[PDB]
Design a protein around this ligand. Sequence first.
Ligand SMILES: *[C@@H]1O[C@H](CO)[C@@H](O)[C@H](O)[C@H]1NC(C)=O
Ligand SMILES: *[C@@H]1O[C@H](CO)[C@@H](O)[C@H](O)[C@H]1NC(C)=O
Ligand SMILES: *[C@@H]1O[C@H](CO)[C@@H](O)[C@H](O)[C@H]1NC(C)=O
Ligand SMILES: *[C@@H]1O[C@H](CO)[C@@H](O)[C@H](O)[C@H]1NC(C)=O
Ligand SMILES: [Zn+2]
Lengths: 195, 596
Amino acid sequence: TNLCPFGEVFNATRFASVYAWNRKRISNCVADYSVLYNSASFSTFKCYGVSPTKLNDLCFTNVYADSFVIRGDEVRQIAPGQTGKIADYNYKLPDDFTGCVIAWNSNNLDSKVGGNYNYLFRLFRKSNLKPFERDISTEIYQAGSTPCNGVEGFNCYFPLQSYGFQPTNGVGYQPYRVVVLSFELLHAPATVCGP
Amino acid sequence: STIEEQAKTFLDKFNHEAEDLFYQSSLASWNYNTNITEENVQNMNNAGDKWSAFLKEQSTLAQMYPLQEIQNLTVKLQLQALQQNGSSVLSEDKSKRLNTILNTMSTIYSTGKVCNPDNPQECLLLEPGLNEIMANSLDYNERLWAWESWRSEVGKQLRPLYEEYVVLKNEMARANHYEDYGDYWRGDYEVNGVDGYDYSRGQLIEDVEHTFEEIKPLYEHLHAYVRAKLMNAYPSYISPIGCLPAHLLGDMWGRFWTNLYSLTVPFGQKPNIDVTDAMVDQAWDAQRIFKEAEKFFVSVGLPNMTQGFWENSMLTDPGNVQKAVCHPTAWDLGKGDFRILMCTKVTMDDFLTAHHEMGHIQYDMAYAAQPFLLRNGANEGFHEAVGEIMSLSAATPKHLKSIGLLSPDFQEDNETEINFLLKQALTIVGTLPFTYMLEKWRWMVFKGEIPKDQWMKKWWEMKREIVGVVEPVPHDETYCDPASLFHVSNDYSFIRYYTRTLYQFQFQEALCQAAKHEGPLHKCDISNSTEAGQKLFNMLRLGKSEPWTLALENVVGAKNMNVRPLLNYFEPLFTWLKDQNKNSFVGWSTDWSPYA
Ligand SMILES: *[C@@H]1O[C@H](CO)[C@@H](O)[C@H](O)[C@H]1NC(C)=O
Ligand SMILES: *[C@@H]1O[C@H](CO)[C@@H](O)[C@H](O)[C@H]1NC(C)=O
Ligand SMILES: *[C@@H]1O[C@H](CO)[C@@H](O)[C@H](O)[C@H]1NC(C)=O
Ligand SMILES: *[C@@H]1O[C@H](CO)[C@@H](O)[C@H](O)[C@H]1NC(C)=O
Ligand SMILES: [Zn+2]
C-alpha cells in the first residue's frame, strides 16, 4: 500500500518555469486519481483518451507528472493540436496524447506587489518543439543575418521573456499552475495500478 | 529573413516589454492619484521616466526597419506609430527650448492669478476663483473684470512664449515632412494604403467646413434666441443685431453656453428631471450606481465588469486624510487591469457619469486582445463619442422609469422636451462654432496665413464673423487670448471635440435604428438590444487596427463624418427656434461692439 507522491507535485512551494518544465516519474505506488478529479479545487481538469470518471481501475507502466506556471489565457495551449508561444516553444503535447491536464489559479502564491518575475517562458525559437521536448538554452536569438556574438542588440534578442505577475492583473494574465499527467503503456511490468 | 519578418520579431519583443513597463507606470500613477503623498509623486515620476526612456529607445530601433519594405499593413501601422520622431527630430537644443516653453506656458496657466483692485492680497486663480465668476455671476462688471484681467495679466505673459512655440513646432513638423504643425495634427485622421477607406489630411479641412455649413442655420437660430433672451435681461448691454459680448456666455471663453440656461429656459415653470431625490430616498450608494451601469451594458450583450474592477477601483472619496484626484477617469492599465477612479456622489449627474466612464471601460476591454500599439480608439474622437452616447440613453425618461428612479406617473410633454433640447444645444451645438473657429485660427497661424502683427485682430474678426461673439475690450497684439484656454497653452489639438460630437450622434442614430426605436431620436434608449450592442461591439473590438473610416462604417454604414444625425437629434428644437425668432433678427452684424 505505497501511495503515489502526488502532493510533492501539486503542493510544491515553487513551480518550474514552463520553458524548463519539471517532469517527475511516478512508479511502484498506488494512485487514488479519483481524489484529484473529485476535489473541486482545479479550474481545468481535462483528460484525453482516458476518462477521469473512475478509471483508477487501470494499471499503467509509468506515470509522468509535468508541472509549470503559465498565465490564464495560455491554459488552452496545453492540449493536443494547439499553437501559440507555449505550445510551439515551451511545452508541446502530442496529437495522440493520452492523459490529463490539470490547472488552477495561483494568484495568491505566484503574484507579488511590484511584480513577481520568477517565471519565464521562451519567446523566440528557430523551430517548434517536438512533443514532450524541453529547451532550456539561453542562446541569443538571431533575428537578422548579422551574428549576435552572445549579446543582445539590433535583431539579437534574449530568447526568454519573464512574466510580470502582479495580484491586480486580470484573470487572463494571472498565474496558473499546471500539472500534466502522462499515462504510458509499455510491453512491460505495469507497476502503477492505484485502486 | 526579410525586413518585414525582422519587424514582426522586433514588435514581438516590444509588446512584451511594453505591457509590463506601461503597467508599472500606470500602477504608480494610480497610487498617486488615489493617495497623494510625496513618495507617490516620486514613484510616479520614476516609473513614468523609465517608460518614456524605453519608448525613446524603442522609437530609434523602430526607425531601423524601412516602412517602404513592409507590406503587411497591421505590421506597418504598429511600426509607424512607434517610429514617429515627435520633438526628437529637432536638434537637442531646440527640443529643450520647446520643452521649456511648453512647461512655462503650462505653469503660467495653472498658477496665473488675478488680484482685485485696491487689495493686492485678495487674488483669484482661474480654478476655482475666476471660473466661479464666469459660470454663476449675473453682474456685467464682475464678469467683465474676470474676462479682461485673465487675458490681460496671464494671456499677455503667454504671447511671447506662444510665438516661439509656433516657430519650433513648425520646425519639428516640416522636419517630419509635414507642411506645418496644423497639418501634423490633421494626420490623426490620415489613412493610406486601404482601397475604399483612404483619407487625406487636407480632406479633414473640407469635411469639417462642409459639415459646418449645414450646422449654421441651427446655430444662427440658437444664437438669435439666446441674444433675444439676454437682451431682455441686459437691455443696455446687448444690441438686437450685434454679436454676443464674449464675457456673457457662461464660462471664461464661451466654449459652452451651458450656464446661460437659467436666463434662456423656454418654459421656466416646468422643473427639470432631477432624479437625485429618488436615489437618496431609496438609499442608493456608489456601488449601486455602478451596478446599475453594469446592468445597462450587460443588457445590450456586453460583458460584465471584471472581478478586479470591483476590487481595485476607487468609486468613493477616500475621505479622511488619504487624499486623491477626484476627476472621473477610466483606467486601462493593461494586463487585463481595468479600473475607474471617481469620487461618486449620490446624484443624477454622477449616475450619468458612471455610465459614461464605464463606456470607456467597455471600449478598453473590447480591444484588449489587439496588439499593444493598436489598443486605442479608431481616432481621437472615437473614445469620447462612445462615452457620451451611454449617458444619452441612461438619462431618458424611458430609461429612468424602467429602473424605478422616475415615477411611472411622469409623462413627457413637449414643453419639458423643448427645455431639455435647449440645454443640450447650449452645450453641444454652442461649442461647435467655438471649436471650429479656434482650430482654424491655429491652422492658419501654423500655415503662415496670419502675420504676428494681426494675430489678435484676425482672432476677433473670426470670433465676430464665425462665432457671432464680440470682445468687450479692444485687444492689441500684446494679448494672446487663444492661449488663455487650457488646450491652446497646453499644446492640445482641438478639432477632436468637433469630430467627436458628430460621431456620437452618428453612433446613437445607428444604434437606435438597430434597437428599432420609434419616435424622436433624443428619446431613445438602447437598453435590452443585443442587436445594438453587437453593432457597437463590431467597432469597439477593432481598436486602432483598422482605418477609422472602416470602423465608423461598422456602426453606421457610412465611411465618413456626417452631420445629419446631429441635426436629426435637434430638429424638434430647430423647428421651435424658427417659430420663436419670427419677430427677431436672425444673424449678426460684426461691426457692433460693446465699447462702441
Ligand atoms: C495538498 O495539500 C492539501 C491540504 O494539505 C491536501 O488536501 C491535498 O490532498 C494535497 N495534494 C495532494 C496531491 O495530495
Ligand atoms: C498611502 O501612501 C503611503 C505611502 O506614500 C502608504 O504608506 C499608505 O499605506 C497609503 N495609504 C493607502 C490607504 O493606500
Ligand atoms: C500580418 O501579420 C500577422 C501576424 O504576423 C498575421 O496574422 C496577418 O495575417 C498578416 N496580415 C497580412 C495581410 O499578411
Ligand atoms: C460575469 O458574468 C459571468 C457569466 O458570463 C459570471 O460567471 C461572472 O461571475 C460575472 N462576474 C461578475 C463580477 O458579475
Ligand atoms: Zn470621457
